Amino acid sequence: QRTGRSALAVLIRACYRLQQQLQRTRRALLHHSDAVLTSLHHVRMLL
Amino acid sequence: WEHRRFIVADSRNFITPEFPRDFWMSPVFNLPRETAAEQVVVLQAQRTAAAAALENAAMQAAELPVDIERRLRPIERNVH
């Protein structure tokens, strides 16, 4: 009982955290490129 | 018919202007080999070139938020 039910816990923890790992990359890589766009935009302002 | 006076156009008709003592020492007759007026024309053109290069670079870099979405979503649905 405790063998197979605890063996799947590693995979459960892996998948339910891989679901968040990519959400973080979704958020972290979009709040950073917007800064690049704003900077290019400001440089266009200077001219 | 018609009448008017006349003056003969002889080669001896000369003219005598007066020159100021400081007339020839002008900053315009005396020009160096390289003036800044040309430098203005070069620098303005370079600035205008950079201006259009900025728009080219902006349209190049507008894909950075786009390239990230489609590289993560098909793996997010893969995990889920």
From Swiss-Prot, chain A:
Cysteine disulfide links: none
UniProt PTM: Proteolytically processed, possibly into several polypeptides. Enzymatic activity is only detectable following cleavage of the UL36 protein, which occurs late during viral replication.
Subcellular location: Virion tegument; Host cytoplasm; Host nucleus
Protein's job: Large tegument protein that plays multiple roles in the viral cycle. During viral entry, remains associated with the capsid while most of the tegument is detached and participates in the capsid transport toward the host nucleus. Plays a role in the routing of the capsid at the nuclear pore complex and subsequent uncoating. Within the host nucleus, acts as a deneddylase and promotes the degradation of nuclear CRLs (cullin-RING ubiquitin ligases) and thereby stabilizes nuclear CRL substrates, while cytoplasmic CRLs remain unaffected.
Family membership: Belongs to the herpesviridae large tegument protein family.
Subunit and interaction comment: Interacts with host CUL1 and CUL4A; these interactions inhibit the E3 ligase activity of cullins. Interacts with inner tegument protein. Interacts with capsid vertex specific component CVC2. Interacts with the major capsid protein/MCP. Interacts with VP16; this interaction is important for outer tegument association to the capsid. May form homodimers.
Stated name of the protein: Large tegument protein deneddylase
Lineage of origin: Viruses, Duplodnaviria, Heunggongvirae, Peploviricota, Herviviricetes
From Swiss-Prot, chain B:
Location in or out of the cell: Virion; Host nucleus
Positions of region (Interaction with major capsid protein/MCP): 1-37, 1-38
Protein family according to the UniProt entry: Belongs to the herpesviridae CVC2 protein family.
Function: Capsid vertex-specific component that plays a role during viral DNA encapsidation, assuring correct genome cleavage and presumably stabilizing capsids that contain full-length viral genomes. Participates in the interaction between the capsid and the tegument through interaction with the large tegument protein/LTP. May mediate the capsid docking to the nuclear pore allowing entry of the viral genome into the host nucleus through binding to host nucleoporins NUP214.
Subunit structure, interactors included: Heterodimerizes with CVC1. Interacts with major capsid protein/MCP and triplex capsid protein 1/TRX1 at the pentamer vertices. Interacts with the large tegument protein/LTP. Interacts with host NUP214; this interaction might be essential to the capsid docking to the host nuclear pore. Interacts with host TMEM250.
This protein's name: Capsid vertex component 2
Portion of the parent chain present: 13 to 92 of 580
